Symmetry: C2
Subunit: 79 residues, 2 copies
């Protein structure tokens, strides 16, 4: 009910290669998501973060993605 069987099955059926692609694409989506100064500063920050993510392992990328998704959910839910 909390984890649908369709979701558990997809994960059960995945190789590490497939998981890594899923993790990378979700992370890229959350990283991507004012004034000119704000816009420019944000572009620089996103580019910097993307360079740093390249140095992370698949598990490290997953942990970062999970933190970022939870933060976004908590903000959305005012928690």
């Amino acid at each position: 009910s909390a984890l649908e069987a369709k979701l558990l099955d997809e994960i059960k059926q995945s190789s590490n290669q497939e998981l890594e692609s899923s993790i990378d694409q979700i992370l890229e989506s959350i990283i991507n998501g004012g004034s000119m100064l704000n816009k420019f500063t944000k572009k620089e920050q996103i580019l910097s973060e993307k360079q740093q993510i390249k140095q992370l392992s698949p598990l490290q990328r997953a942990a970062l993605a999970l933190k970022k998704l939870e933060t976004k959910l908590n903000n959305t839910l005012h928690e």
Copy 2:
């Protein structure tokens, strides 16, 4: 903010796999356990219990990376269902 984001990335990079897995697993647990009694009847509550036990059993057999990917998929799905 950006400084705290840089800080988090550095902490994650420096962390052991067991450290990251402990966080991921606990978040996953918090998701599985996050619902209600399953309804008014004894059979409702029992059925819910057995479902969660089955999910926990399945998760136990997953690799650390499978568990991480499962958590991310679930939260992505939750966000999709929440954002409007």
